[PDB]
Structure 1
Amino acid sequence: EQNLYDVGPRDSEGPGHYIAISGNTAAGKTTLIETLAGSLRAAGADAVGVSERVFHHRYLKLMFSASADFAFPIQLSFMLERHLLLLDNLVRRGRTMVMERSHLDDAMFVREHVASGAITAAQQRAYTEVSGELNARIPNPDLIVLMNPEPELSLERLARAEAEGSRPREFPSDAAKRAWVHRWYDLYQELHDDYRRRAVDGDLRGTELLELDAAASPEEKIATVTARARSLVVG
């Protein structure tokens, strides 16, 4: 439907535009992603919204129920599938991608599993060497939107989704779900501090970093993001 896996020739030169949300969106931001992509299509871009549920491996549950065995290959899978989707749609085909998560944020999830002992130091070093080669072939996002919901909100949304059958219970216990969500939130607070430095005198000079007002209603929030993304659409 979104033609994400078309190996035919480009039907346009250069890469498209790359917009990414960054935060602990453990319950997803699918309405925001899809609405934003739709607003870019209205402006005339070939725009696709890509939630993480496009990248979840069929074995996803095992990264949380059998972490010592599956967290390393499943983390490799997130990185790799995201890489290939961007390399084809954004770079090769010049499309506009609105991502729930950029290629810059996957390493944080490896760091979590390393601190728990599910991924070894040697596995992490191998991941880092492949990640460095892959990320060197993908442009930085053009617009990064920092949105880290608080863990209690993430968990309330997840609990409702699991109860209503709209997503499977992917964790092995209620406590494990809460603990991963809190660990990711804590890491994302540090990651976002890093982003504010990166954007000013690190490798994200050249990227627009957008921070929201957490007290702003949702409606002021999509409107703010939409305005900045529409600056990129070339008719």
Structure 2
Amino acid sequence: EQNLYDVGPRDSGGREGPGHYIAISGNTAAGKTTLIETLAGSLRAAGADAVGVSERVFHHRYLKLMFSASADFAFPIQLSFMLERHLLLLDNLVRRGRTMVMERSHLDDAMFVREHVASGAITAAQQRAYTEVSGELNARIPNPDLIVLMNPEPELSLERLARAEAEGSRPRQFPSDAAKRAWVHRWYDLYQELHDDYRRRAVDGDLRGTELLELDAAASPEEKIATVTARARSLVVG
């Protein structure tokens, strides 16, 4: 529908360079999909060649093995998340000049490798190889232009996940109820640290040209849309 995998030539009129790049940053079941789909449609209405990319686009067929056999599959499935996200951005954002609304940016994947390194599922040597490739890939992708910091509390994530799994609107990704609870909590803690890093790197680090926006994951979806649209509308190019 959104022409995400077109290997044909760029069609951006007279506008040169990459499109613009909006990303949500937060733990699972933060309430992202209504937001990013609405934003992509409103940016298109303003004349932007914009697309919204749900993270489910990047779910490998083998995703569940990351969580049921993590010391075997966490390293290559983490490579898959960063590689497939990279390729989609390199083609759509950079090569074809389109504007992206992402449920997760290329800057967030490293924290998921950190989680598996701490648990022991990914070795230090695997992490070093990952980081070498990640640095080369990320150097070819512009920083996100607007990052929405939206980290849900763990019990909110788990309530939303439980309802979605019960009604069959998403699959059961974890090997046990406790594995789901534990990964959600470990990711929550890492995301709190990552967002504090973001606040620093937007002032004294590599993101001084990027806008950060804080957003409560428990806010109503209409409030989320209104808050993020007020900043995203400014980024429209034809």
Q: Specify if TM > 0.5.
A: yes
SS of aligned partner of 1:231: helix
TM-score (norm 1): 0.97
**CA drift at 1:2:** 0.8
TM-score (norm 2): 0.96
**CA drift at 1:220:** 2.5
Taking the aligned partners of 2:71 and 2:55, their CA distance within structure 1 comes to 22
| Number of residues of Structure 1 aligned to a counterpart in Structure 2 | 235
**CA drift at 1:227:** 1.2
Distance of aligned partners of 1:151 and 1:215 in 2 relative to their CA distance in 1, 3 Å threshold: closer
**CA drift at 1:46:** 1.1
Distance of aligned partners of 1:124 and 1:82 in 2 relative to their CA distance in 1, 3 Å threshold: same
Contact 1:27 1:158 in 2 (8 A): no
Taking the aligned partners of 1:213 and 1:37, their CA distance within structure 2 comes to 20
Contact 2:35 2:221 in 1 (8 A): no
Identity %: 100
**CA drift at 1:27:** 6.2
**CA drift at 1:28:** 5.4
Contact 2:85 2:106 in 1 (8 A): yes
Taking the aligned partners of 1:66 and 1:29, their CA distance within structure 2 comes to 28
Question: Counterparts in 2 of 1:1-235, with a 5 A limit?
Answer: 1-12=1-12, 13-26=16-29, 29-212=32-215, 217-235=220-238
Taking the aligned partners of 2:7 and 2:217, their CA distance within structure 1 comes to 41
Between 207-216 and 15-24, the greater mean CA deviation after superposition: 207-216
Distance of aligned partners of 1:215 and 1:123 in 2 relative to their CA distance in 1, 3 Å threshold: closer
SS of aligned partner of 1:45: coil
Distance of aligned partners of 1:119 and 1:28 in 2 relative to their CA distance in 1, 3 Å threshold: farther
User: Can you list the C-alpha shifts for 1:190-225, whole angstroms capped at 9, x where unaligned?
Assistant: 000000000011000100111125675442321010
Distance of aligned partners of 1:208 and 1:83 in 2 relative to their CA distance in 1, 3 Å threshold: same
**CA drift at 1:226:** 0.4
User: Can you list the C-alpha shifts for 1:111-135, whole angstroms capped at 9, x where unaligned?
Assistant: 0000010000000000000000000
Between 210-219 and 64-73, the greater mean CA deviation after superposition: 210-219
Taking the aligned partners of 1:201 and 1:123, their CA distance within structure 2 comes to 30
Between 213-222 and 94-103, the greater mean CA deviation after superposition: 213-222
SS of aligned partner of 1:112: helix
Taking the aligned partners of 2:215 and 2:3, their CA distance within structure 1 comes to 31
SS of aligned partner of 2:27: coil
Distance of aligned partners of 1:5 and 1:150 in 2 relative to their CA distance in 1, 3 Å threshold: same
Structure 1 unaligned blocks of 5 or more:
none
Between 23-32 and 38-47, the greater mean CA deviation after superposition: 23-32
Runs of 4+ aligned structure 1 residues displaced above 3 Å come to 213-218
- Alignment RMSD (CA, Å): 1.2
User: Can you list the C-alpha shifts for 1:69-128, whole angstroms capped at 9, x where unaligned?
Assistant: 000000000000000000000000000100000000000000000001000000000000
Contact 2:52 2:100 in 1 (8 A): yes
Structure 2 unaligned blocks of 5 or more:
none
Taking the aligned partners of 2:217 and 2:62, their CA distance within structure 1 comes to 34
Contact 2:35 2:224 in 1 (8 A): no
Distance of aligned partners of 1:118 and 1:204 in 2 relative to their CA distance in 1, 3 Å threshold: same
